[PDB]
């Protein structure tokens, strides 16, 4: 069963896989159903725009933290600073998330400004009636995009001081590596009679 120069393949088919094959012939039909569901939902619901306004959020790890992203909700602090309560926000089309916290003023201010823009660009129908028609939009996300914040302009002067960035990195690495040894050495040298 082993033969000429070829790669070792690891094909995991020693089970009854033919009983669990799924072929997505339903792709285009599910698409149609999904469009019809969106349409039905829009009509049945309201002039409301099919989606809640979601916040700007800084993504996790070093791979992705350079990006900024749409999150789930708007951190009761941010909502209170925008000048409204969580319950009214949930009624008005704002996603709220109790289980996240603001540690960064940049994201906090961006999301507060986002909320102010939304609060200005909506019109809220009264409780009573007379229903001023509004000709709905379907995407709060499309009306309120997610813009990447820029750091610095294209052109700047050169500020050199001869610090050797490579040496800087190596010394940071060495400092972290030999911190504990030094913090034990100094401690046990302080034990001077």
């Amino acid at each position: 069963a082993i033969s000429k120069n070829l790669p070792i393949l690891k094909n995991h088919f020693r089970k009854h896989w033919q009983e669990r094959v799924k072929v997505h012939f339903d792709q285009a039909g599910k698409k149609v159903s999904r469009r019809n569901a969106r349409a039905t939902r829009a009509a049945k619901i309201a002039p409301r725009p099919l989606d809640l306004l979601r916040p700007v959020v800084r993504a996790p790890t070093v791979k992705y933290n350079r990006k900024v992203r749409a999150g789930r909700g708007f951190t009761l602090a941010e909502v209170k600073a925008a000048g409204l309560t969580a319950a009214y926000a949930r009624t008005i089309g704002i996603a709220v998330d109790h289980r996240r916290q603001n540690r960064n003023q940049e994201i906090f201010d961006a999301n507060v400004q986002r909320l102010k823009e939304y609060q200005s660009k909506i019109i809220v129908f009264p409780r009573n009636g007379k229903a001023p028609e509004a000709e709905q939009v379907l995407s709060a996300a499309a009306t309120f995009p997610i813009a990447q914040p820029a750091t610095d302009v294209e052109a700047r002067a050169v500020q050199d001081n001869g610090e050797s960035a490579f040496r800087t990195l190596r010394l940071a690495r060495s400092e972290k590596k030999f911190r504990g040894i030094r913090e034990k050495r100094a401690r046990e040298k302080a034990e001077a009679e």
């Binding site: 069963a1 082993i2 033969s3 000429k4 120069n5 070792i8």
Partner: peptide
């Protein structure tokens, strides 16, 4: 049907000269 085995049988016994020479390190 499978006169030398199934899959990767004999890598140390009767398919060894294939694994050495074309797969050293396996």
């Amino acid at each position: 049907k499978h006169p030398g085995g199934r899959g990767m049988a004999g890598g140390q016994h009767h398919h060894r000269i294939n694994m050495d020479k074309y797969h050293p390190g396996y």
